Amino acid sequence: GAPWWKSAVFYQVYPRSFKDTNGDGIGDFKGLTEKLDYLKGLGIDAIWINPHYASPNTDNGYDISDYREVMKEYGTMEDFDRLMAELKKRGMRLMVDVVINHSSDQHEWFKSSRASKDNPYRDYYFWRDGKDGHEPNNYPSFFGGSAWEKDPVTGQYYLHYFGRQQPDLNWDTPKLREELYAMLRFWLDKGVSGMRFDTVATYSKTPGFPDLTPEQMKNFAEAYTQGPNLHRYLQEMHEKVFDHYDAVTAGEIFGAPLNQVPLFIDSRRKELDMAFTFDLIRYDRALDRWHTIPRTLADFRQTIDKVDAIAGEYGWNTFFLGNHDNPRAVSHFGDDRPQWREASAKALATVTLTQRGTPFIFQGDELGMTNYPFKTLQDFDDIEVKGFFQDYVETGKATAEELLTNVALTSRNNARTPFQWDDSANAGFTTGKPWLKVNPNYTEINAAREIGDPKSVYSFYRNLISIRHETPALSTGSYRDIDPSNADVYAYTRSQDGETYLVVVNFKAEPRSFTLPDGMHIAETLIESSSPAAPAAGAASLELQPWQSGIYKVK
Ligand SMILES: [Ca+2]
């Protein structure tokens, strides 16, 4: 039998930018709770929320100062409990974000740890002497400069793969692991249905911390996933935690080669249930994670093919076209120009909700929200781009103008602009001043305008979700790309229990033709976007409008 999460449709809420209810410009728990009916009406089964714990917000939640307290900005523990209860009343499930590769430098564990060399919290983190007057080794950080930061109190350096205020936790210390396990139980005991593990592949560090080779240096993310005890630790966490609950686990597998992924998600291995990979979402990103590289539909579909393959029989993938760290789906994979935005957004919706795996819809993509028109430096404000300035502008590798030109297309802030609820002040997100500026296009792109319009992107998403829910093959069915080399039209089948469905999506802003495989004919049309007429029963080919998508039952 297949678990509930294989056929579930997930929705990612970024609480900071979802709904503000006290005018401070920051989204909160009360805001999310007020909007559960909206998400329920959309057809959402489960919600993944980004970190909601106590945090100095150097990385908007990903620097946690206390794992057993909620973030002051979002509300109180009572607000969280109310959120939990209100989700339960609607039969909805909650997936929380788990950030245990690192903590905030303001966490009490680290305050104690850094205070001396001989305290019981010293080995909760990684402290090392520098060498040759410099850092312990040549480890660079993802968020700028060295991954080693010297502390004048002890004269040693502490490790941080990410922000300087995000010191890595030491999984080699059994006592630390037990603290994390107890922490997970704290939230699981409250009834949490899911856990998403932030940078799950970097938990294990390399013994002795030897220097990275020049080859390794070019893509150091990979080396950070080559910890010798990685899967040993993940298996222990399952044994001591997940094996005692009925929660689904998902891993942000960052930096790891696709061929390593089955080690995380093979159900027989008793590690994680689902994989978030970077292959598709970063398929057109350069190695520096800020430059863009031109790609076609052929690249797009072939990546999906590869990702689906490693899932195999015993593993499972998530599928997403957007998250909190990426440009908007329609801007990134579609055509966000005014005359093509809605059509392409619907086409991407069709793709999202007919992939093999568990789809995650990022907040606002169901409205067809786009990239933000960056202007000022302040618009880009984010710890990652700040690191890019440190590593690329200060070093003279690139000008500020060059960086911003590119980052405008790849900025994480593209996904973090306030959710657009209506056409009131700041799109009805807040009564005050939003922490990040609202996209000006909210006047024509907002929830209120699209709910009432049956032709909207929202209604199309809602119809697709309904269709996927009623059609097992669209979730747990097999997957087959009709023509991996085709760069114009995306076409594939989903099959289960003798029932085969055909998905055809035109990725061009021009009319295209599509011929069905030999011996395959249209039986029914389930749904289409931007199509003036459904195909006749028994059709062996389709005529596609620009950006037309469709789901067909075949015979
Ligand atoms: Ca607020």
Annotated binding site for Ca(2+): 20, 22, 24, 26, 28
Residues in the chain: 555
End-to-end Cα separation, the chain, in angstroms? 27
The tally of CA atoms less than 13 A away on the side-chain side of residue 25 is 8
The tally of CA atoms less than 13 A away on the side-chain side of residue 90 is 23
Residue ranges, comma separated, of all CATH 3.20.20.80 domains in the chain are: 1-103+174-477
Whole-Å CA distances, 489 to 145, 382, 481: 43, 36, 11
- Measure 447 CA to ligand 1 centroid, in angstroms: 20
Residue ranges, comma separated, of all CATH 2.60.40.1180 domains in the chain are: 478-555
Exposure string over 241-271, b if 16+ CB within 10 A, otherwise e: bbeebebbbbbbbbbbebebbbbbbbeebeb
Residue ranges, comma separated, of all CATH 3.90.400.10 domains in the chain are: 104-173
Angle at 240 between CA 235 and CA 242, to 5 degrees: 75
- Measure 250 CA to ligand 1 centroid, in angstroms: 28
CA dist., res. 548 & res. 531, Å (int) = 6
CA dist., res. 138 & res. 130, Å (int) = 11
Which position has the token pair 């229990």?
497
Give the pairing type, strands 194-197 and 93-98. parallel
CA dist., res. 485 & res. 483, Å (int) = 5
Which architecture, in CATH terms, is 104-173? Answer: Alpha-Beta Complex (3.90)
CA dist., res. 328 & res. 422, Å (int) = 19
Residue in 149, 252, 266, 366 annotated catalytic: 252
Q: How many CB atoms lie within 10 A of CB 481?
A: 16
Angle at 140 between CA 329 and CA 403, to 5 degrees: 45
Q: Using the Cα atoms of residue 427, residue 430, residue 433 and residue 435 in order, give the sign of their dihedral.
A: negative
Residue 47: name the closest of 148, 195, 232, 174 by CA.
Answer: 195
Q: How was this structure determined?
A: X-ray
**Does the active-site annotation cover 252?**
yes
- Measure 151 CA to ligand 1 centroid, in angstroms: 35
The resolution of the experimental structure, rounded to one decimal in Å, is 2.2
Which position has the token pair 């480890």?
139
Residues forming a β-bridge with 159: 148
Contact 96, 187 (CB under 8 A): yes
- Measure 63 CA to ligand 1 centroid, in angstroms: 19
Which architecture, in CATH terms, is 1-103+174-477? Answer: Alpha-Beta Barrel (3.20)
CA dist., res. 262 & res. 266, Å (int) = 5
The 3-state DSSP class for residue 42 equals helix
- Measure 357 CA to ligand 1 centroid, in angstroms: 34
**Does the active-site annotation cover 366?**
no
Contacts of 343 (CB under 8 A, 6+ apart): 335, 529, 530, 546, 547, 548
Contact 12, 323 (CB under 8 A): yes
Residues forming a β-bridge with 194: 95, 248
CA dist., res. 547 & res. 235, Å (int) = 45
Contact 552, 525 (CB under 8 A): yes
Residue 10: name the closest of 327, 353, 334 by CA.
Answer: 353
The 3-state DSSP class for residue 466 equals helix
CATH superfamily ID and name for 478-555: Golgi alpha-mannosidase II (2.60.40.1180)
Residue in 73, 97, 198, 342 annotated catalytic: 198
- Measure 543 CA to ligand 1 centroid, in angstroms: 49
Annotated binding site: 20, 22, 24, 26, 28
Q: How many CB atoms lie within 10 A of CB 462?
A: 20
